[PDB]
Symmetry: C6
Subunit: 215 residues, 6 copies
């Protein structure tokens, strides 16, 4: 993707975010996206090519790999990143929509650009959208973290998997490619995801005290 | 890319904005960044229990006449085409709310998208006999002797992405149908 | 970035039908070739399987039945078809130093439409003659040296290649009709 | 890319616009879009009827000292160099599109250099590959291959088609370049 | 690209100009265009003298828990964030050089970079018992019978780039430490 | 897009000879390495063939005769040579916060002197490491675990030799150009 357009999309969501929202944005891009693109994706390049099974049965390797890896880790991370970034994209354009009409209403200027560049305030219709966007981000993050644990019975990848699905005779020993490196990147992705959950929850505390304690 | 998105985003109703984000963020991105690499080794890792030369080539062709990603890519182009035609036709009248002559073009564009979305979903169901991929396919086409056993690559991952594409495509049908109600009811009442 | 600028220049300086022709050329001819068709032909020779033990038999049999790839033939056709349209813009800018069709622009525009029809018809004719039809076969019988007698060879993804061949041929036939009507519209104005 | 093409396009004569079209649309695009991946498996699919280790390596090297696409890449870089450097030299002298004063010498030399570069590479293509037609079979007897070994080329017919197209297109550029030489020499002699 | 570097270039001290040059023109440039292709066949060309299935997989994983390029990519990302961390706090004050909170963040960012650079250097030494790659690795992990002999791909080229990265990273430590001494002289030693 | 901006900045701040040197580096050193030479070395180890049955003999043999790839050595040389040119712009911008005079005279002279050393050092490394500028078809190998001496064959030795000669010759031109600039500065300083 074009680096110039990468600035445009990153720049647009940067201005239309709260003080904490900029910290969450940095962690999302520098850590979640950059690691997945420049480091993690090449690790899973030979996941099935270097999957070795001690057998002479045709088709045994195909079914055993599919049984133990129903969906790849990188594919799961890619889906989670899209699901998490989408609510932030919608709430960012809503802020620009309200900022544009307020400037348009004044004309139809110098003061309105001062307050908009000062800080991003959540009030009115923005309160419902921004709160819901945070709520969906926490749910999406927890759901994918739960899926990772249930599907792969932990965050540690094993060197050897025992497979007994048809057409493999009895139980067949199979060996995973780069289990240690995949474990290291799985832990890094999980830990950073937990940090993103804490930032979203902390932001929710700021909004709640502004309304609940305000009354 | 931002210029193309900006043009379509400017000229749309409230439902149209929701239809755009579902089209761009979901159908295009997961196909580009997630789904396409799943189908990379579809024929390379297609394994058949046989010694007959050429048996693997004809069995893969029989069971996968067109790849899932190729069908999705064709469908995405067809669905997005009427939206681009509206922008081109709108600019034609500008240099030379929806009402007037634009009302018929906008209504027809939604009607075409529903037909294209449903037609491709029908092709997916008929061609592959459901949305779940099997681990084993039994093939008996020439020159394979009798019936041979062949095994698909990543059947479970492909099923997961197939369900995701079908479900999101079904949501787009409902959104387009809903927009067809806000136009027919308003005009006829 | 760069793609938008090139498309905008051609789109702005176009007639009524010519803009309909432009969207067919880009959205269908180019996108199908780029995002779908090119990866279909990726393993055309790697997965070409011949039932023989003769060294070098596979190389000659593939060459005999595929003198040029379908995707390379389509790439050549697209460049040849798009060239007259771009030649009009550069010559028009040259005349600026020196869209209604009047003056010396009439001869260049009419010739550009005329040339595009010939290029589309020529490439369509080449496709039919060279591959004896628009449908790919699963099996090809090859008896070129050094293959002993006649050997059996099997094509990779014949069905998908047939589907994309039909799509490219049918869409190119639409472009031929669109250019004919544009030529007819110009002929009506001058004949009357 | 658009700015680079736009700058050269603006600072050119009438024929120079035509020559720019032939170089970019046909020579560069077809080399990048179509020709480059035709030669992708030139050595991977080079098959020799032998059991001698290392025989395939020396036979391919003997018959293909440099790839056609690599030779065409050097032509495109060398041919386009006088056009770009003439713009820098024009800009340098201007700040310190007819011809006047020193621009006549720089422009005429650039056209002359392009013709020499065009003909030299075409001569290399003919001499090195003894014609523009690629053969299916090559007979190789270099060490360590025992006696004569039969080897088979990958996609000889498709490579022949693109070789003919590149030679013919580059030949057109020679005719267009010498036309500018006649368009300039006739004016100098008349004056 | 240019604007990203332009912003950091205009927001750094005198030594910070040199530090940014070492980070981008050397660490990133070598990794992207020179080093990443050296490690492309790290496991494909890993050869083990054995007939045991699965022995090659476990032996490569044991001796290369994480690739050098992956470790360098993580180090580059971690080292570059404290610079952006101080950039966001600077922008935070703009919505309302060393002064007040800035001195307590710029100094902290420098301290973090030194720790991150030393931590990754320490990890590189301990994990790979030195900065020199060996041609032969002896592996006795299950299921390999007894001890098997395995051979690394391009050990010498990987050693050359490892020395380049380690030495350049060590220079960044000295520059950060030297700049930290400048700040401490002005503030603490100036009391 | 970004490449034009970087080239434009360096071009706008350079001497008359320095603009020629920039052209030789970008047109010949970078472009040929990127679009032509890089893929020539693509199968350098995959197509390296050794006449042996000893496991691991091929790995240690390729490493012995190619400690670093030619393209990797060229890539390092390009980065090292271009660094002083970009360092001048970075230092100039900081000082601001084409005539050569003042303290900038020392920086410009040092940058040219550093470039001459860098090209000379890399040219010396190329000659010593590969005992010449011509690649051999056959390399003899007696490193462990290869038994006795084994025969190994290099991939595309002739094409690599052609590009090696071209890069060395162009590097020598840049050395002469930089030395010429050193003469036009000492004459304007010592004689004047
Ligand atoms: C954040 C980084 C988290 C790293 C967690 C590492 C957990 C796995 C582990 O114990 O790794 C050991 C070596 O670690 C390593 O090689 C990685 C250590 C950290 C490297 C730098 C990360 C940035 C291997 O120990 P083991 O024998 O359990 O190996 C497992 C084979 N099944
Ligand atoms: C959108 C979410 C779609 C989830 C359902 C898709 C998969 C349905 C089939 C299924 O249950 O698969 C079994 C386990 O799958 C799984 O465990 C797939 C779970 C996917 C997690 C959600 C990802 C987001 C494998 O069983 P099988 O062998 O029948 O698989 C079929 C191939 N043979
Ligand atoms: C777009 C053009 C689609 C119509 C032409 C399709 C011709 C091929 C065709 O009918 O193939 C059948 C299945 O294809 C299909 O089912 C193709 C469906 C295309 C869906 C729209 C895209 C099986 O034809 P066959 O098994 O005899 O194939 C003989 C080749 N080897
Ligand atoms: C100028 C651009 C067009 C050049 C076309 C002719 C070039 C190749 C000459 C040989 C020829 O006619 O090829 C026959 C099929 O033609 C083809 O495949 C020519 C297709 C050209 C389509 C338009 C582009 C194969 O016949 P052969 O076996 O004698 O080929 C000998 C090579 N091996
Ligand atoms: C910073 C510059 C780093 C240069 C030194 C790194 C290599 C040190 C080891 C060494 O002398 O390598 C021997 C020859 O290498 C060489 O001759 C490498 C020369 C590199 C030229 C400088 C490139 C810049 C091979 O000997 P070995 O077998 O011990 O190699 C190790 C694998 N086993
Ligand atoms: C700068 C250009 C440098 C050209 C000469 C360098 C290569 C020297 C070897 C040489 O002359 O190769 C010949 C082929 O020429 C070629 O391949 C010359 C191609 C020149 C193209 C334009 C640049 C045949 O040399 P041989 O068959 O005796 O080689 C056996 C040893 N490998």
């Amino acid at each position: 993707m074009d680096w110039g357009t990468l600035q445009t999309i990153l720049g647009g969501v940067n201005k239309h975010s709260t003080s904490i929202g900029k910290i969450w944005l940095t962690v999302l891009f520098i850590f979640r996206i950059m690691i997945l693109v420049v480091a993690a994706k090449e690790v899973w390049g030979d996941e099935q090519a270097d999957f070795v099974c001690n057998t002479l049965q045709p088709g045994c390797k195909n079914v055993c790999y599919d049984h133990y890896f129903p969906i790849s880790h990188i594919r799961l991370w890619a889906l989670q990143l899209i699901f998490v970034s989408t609510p932030a994209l919608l709430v960012a354009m809503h802020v620009a929509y309200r900022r544009h009409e307020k400037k348009r209403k004044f004309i139809k200027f110098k003061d309105i650009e001062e307050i908009k560049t000062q800080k991003v305030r959540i009030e009115g219709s923005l309160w419902w959208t921004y709160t819901s966007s945070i709520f969906f981000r926490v749910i999406f993050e927890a759901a994918f973290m739960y899926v990772f644990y249930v599907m792969y019975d932990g965050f540690s990848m094993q060197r050897l998997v025992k497979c007994n699905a048809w057409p493999c005779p009895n139980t067949v020993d199979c060996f995973v490619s780069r289990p240690t490196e995949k474990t290291v990147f799985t832990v890094f992705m999980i830990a950073v995801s937990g940090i993103c959950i804490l930032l979203n929850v902390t932001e929710l505390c700021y909004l709640l005290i502004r309304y609940c304690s305000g009354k």
